[PDB]
Design a protein around this ligand. Structure first.
Ligand SMILES: N[C@@H](CCC(=O)N[C@@H](CS)C(=O)NCC(=O)O)C(=O)O
Ligand SMILES: N[C@@H](CCC(=O)N[C@@H](CS)C(=O)NCC(=O)O)C(=O)O
Lengths: 326, 327
C-alpha cells in the first residue's frame, strides 16, 4: 500500500482514524471517449487516438487480463502499447524488474516500481497500487485503473479510428450483463480470494461454498446456450473466463477451492477452451507469470513459496460448442 | 517436537545439534511379539503372544499407524489388542492424550497427558522422535515396537494359535515380490508425498512429486493386470499402499501439493481404493475428521492459517467390480 505519497511494505498501517483509503484512491475513474468529453465519472478530455495511451498490466492478474483480451478482440494493438510488470509482487508491490521472461520493465519511463507512476500522477496519493493501469502518455497521468470500465472504453471509443467490429456491451443485453457481472464478481471473481485469504475456518467455508454453488449455476446456464447471455459473446463471459483460466492452475490448490476442477464440468471446461482458442487469445495467457505470481507472492498463505506441479489439463482440445449451439 | 536425553523440546529439536545423529535411542524400539516368546531378529525375547497384555497407541490420522489397525481387523485381533487414539492435533507437545475430539480416547491405560510420557517410562533418558504407532506391553510397562512395518508382521502370525483369523499377508511364496514393492512404494509414495509436502526448495519438491506421479502411473499399470499388487491375493504391500491412497485425495493432493491427478482419475487405483475400503471391518478404521484435522491444523509450517480445504469430492461406497473383472 501507498499512504499519502510514501510506500509501506505491507505496513498498511498502524490503524485508521479517518477514514477509508482514500480521497484519491479511485480518483482514477476517467473515461477514454471518442469526442474527448468526460465519461460518466471523472473528467475529460482523454480523446481516442493513436500513440497516446498505454497499458500497465501483470499477465498474472485476472483483472488486468480482461483489458488484454479486449485489446485483442477489438484490434487495438496498433493503438495501445503495453508494459508488463514482474510476476513476483513482493515487499515493494508491483515491480518493473524485467529478466523474468515476458516482463518488459516500464517500457515508457523506465521506472522501478508501479507505485512510482501513481505518484507521477498524484504525489499526495493515498491508496492501493493496482494493475491494470490505463495511462495517458501525453498528460503523464492515469486515465483509469478500473478494469470493468477500461474494457468498456475499448469497446467503442476506437471504432471510428478503425477498431475491429464487435460490441461486448450491446444495449439489448446490458441489464442481463450487469446482473451476471454482479454475482459472478461477488461469488467467483472475488469469491476465490475471499476463500483463499479467508481469516477463519467459518469464513472460508462460506466463501468456498458460494464459489461452487455459482459454478453449478454457471454449468447449468452453459448449459442452455453457448455463452452466458445466449449465442453472443459479451464482457460478462470475458470477466468470468479470466478467473476460469486461473482456476485449475492456481485457485484449486493455492486458494483451496478444491471440491471440483474446471476440467470436471462438461460446459465450463468447454467454455474455457472455447474462448481460449479464439484467434489471438492464447497469447495473452502466460501460466508461468500466473503461477509464479500466486504461489510466490502470497507468503501469508504459502510461506514455503513452493509452486505446485498443477492439475493436468489440455486447453487445445477441440470443444465443439460452435457446433453444439444453438 | 522431540525428546532429547529425557527432555522434550517444543520443536527446537534441537538448537541445531552439535551432537549429533540422534542417538543412543536411535536404536528405537524394535522388539518382536512372537508365538513362543523367543526374540525376533532384533531386540530381546519375552514378548509372547497372549490376551490382556498388549496395547496399541495410534493416531487415526497416521498412515503408518493405520497399517496396524487394518492388520488388527483382518487378523481378528480385537480380543488381544486394546487401543488408544491420541488427539489429531499435534502441536508444541507432540502427540497428545487430549480427548474431547470425537474418536480421541485419552490414555486408556494410565491416563497420561502426552505420548512422550510413555516413551519416557520405557526409557527415562530417551532421545528421538515420539511417534505412533506404539505397541505397548502392559505386563512389563515398556514399548515392544514403534515400527509399523514390523508390527504388522507380528500381528500376521504371532497369534495364529490363539484364535487369530486365518490369513497370511506375507506368505513365503510372495515375500520377494512384496519386499521389492514395499521398497519403491515406500520411497516414492508412502514417504514420497511427505518429501513433496515438506520440500525445502522448489527443486526438492519437483523431484519428489514427479516420482509420486511416476509411481502411481506404474501402479495403475500393475493394478490393471490383477486384483492386487502381486496377483489375486491381498498382501501387506497392498495394505501399505492403501493407507497412503486413502489419504491422497482428502489431504495429499492439496495439502502436500501432489495435485497433478486425483486418485479418482485412475480407473484401477481408484478401484483398488474402493475395493479394500469396502472389506468388512476396514471402513471403521477410516476417520476423515482425524485425517483432515491432523494434517491441515498441525502443519503450520506448510499451512499457517490452519484452514481445512473443503476437499476433493469422492465416494468410496460405489461398487468396484474388481472381484469379478479378474480374472
Ligand atoms: N478493481 C480494480 C483492482 C484490480 C486489482 O484487484 N488488481 C490486483 C491484481 S490481483 C492488484 O494489482 N493488487 C495489488 C495490491 O492490492 O496491492 C480492477 O478491477 O482492476
Ligand atoms: N517409524 C514409524 C513412522 C511412523 C511415523 O513417523 N508416524 C508419524 C505420524 S504421520 C508420527 O508419529 N510422527 C510424529 C513426529 O515425528 O513428531 C513407523 O513406521 O511405524
Amino acid at each position: 500500500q501507498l499512504i499519502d505519497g510514501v510506500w509501506h511494505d505491507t505496513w498498511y498501517d498502524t490503524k485508521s482514524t479517518g477514514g477509508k483509503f482514500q480521497r484519491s484512491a479511485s480518483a482514477f475513474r476517467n473515461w477514454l471517449t471518442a469526442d474527448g468529453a468526460p465519461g460518466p465519472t471523472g473528467t475529460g478530455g482523454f480523446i481516442a487516438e493513436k500513440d497516446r495511451y498505454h497499458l500497465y498490466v501483470s499477465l498474472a492478474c485476472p483483472w488486468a487480463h480482461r483489458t488484454l483480451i479486449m485489446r485483442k478482440l477489438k484490434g487495438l494493438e496498433p493503438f495501445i502499447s503495453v508494459s508488463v510488470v514482474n510476476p513476483l509482487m513482493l515487499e515493494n508491490g508491483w515491480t518493473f524488474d524485467d529478466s523474468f521472461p515476458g516482463a518488459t520493465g516500464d517500457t515508457l519511463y523506465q521506472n522501478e516500481f508501479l507505485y512510482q507512476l501513481y505518484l507521477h500522477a498524484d504525489p499526495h496519493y493515498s491508496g492501493r497500487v493496482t494493475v491494470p493501469v490505463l495511462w495517458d502518455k501525453k498528460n503523464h497521468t492515469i486515465v483509469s485503473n478500473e478494469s470493468a470500465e477500461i474494457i468498456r472504453m475499448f469497446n467503442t471509443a476506437f471504432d471510428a479510428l478503425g477498431a475491429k467490429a464487435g460490441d461486448y456491451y450491446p444495449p439489448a443485453l446490458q441489464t442481463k450483463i450487469d446482473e451476471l457481472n454482479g454475482w459472478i464478481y461477488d461469488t467467483v471473481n472475488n469469491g476465490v480470494y475471499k476463500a483463499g485469504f479467508a481469516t477463519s475456518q467459518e469464513a472460508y467455508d462460506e466463501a468456498v461454498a458460494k464459489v461452487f454453488e455459482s459454478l453449478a449455476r454457471l454449468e447449468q446456464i452453459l448449459g442452455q446456450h453457448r455463452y452466458l447471455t445466449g449465442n453472443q459473446l459479451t464482457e460478462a463471459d470475458i470477466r468470468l473466463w479470466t478467473t476460469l483460466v486461473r482456476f485449475d492452475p492456481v485457485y484449486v490448490t493455492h486458494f483451496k477451492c478444491d471440491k471440483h476442477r474446471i476440467s470436471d464440468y462438461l460446459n465450463l471446461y468447454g467454455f474455457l477452451r472455447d474462448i481460449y482458442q479464439m484467434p489471438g487469445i492464447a497469447e495473452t495467457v502466460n501460466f508461468d507469470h500466473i503461477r509464479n505470481h500466486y504461489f510466490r507472492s502470497h507468503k501469508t498463505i504459502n510461506p514455503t513459496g513452493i509452486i505446485s506441479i498443477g492439475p493436468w489439463q489440455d486447453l487445445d482440445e477441440p470443444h465443439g460448442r460452435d457446433v453444439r449451439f444453438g
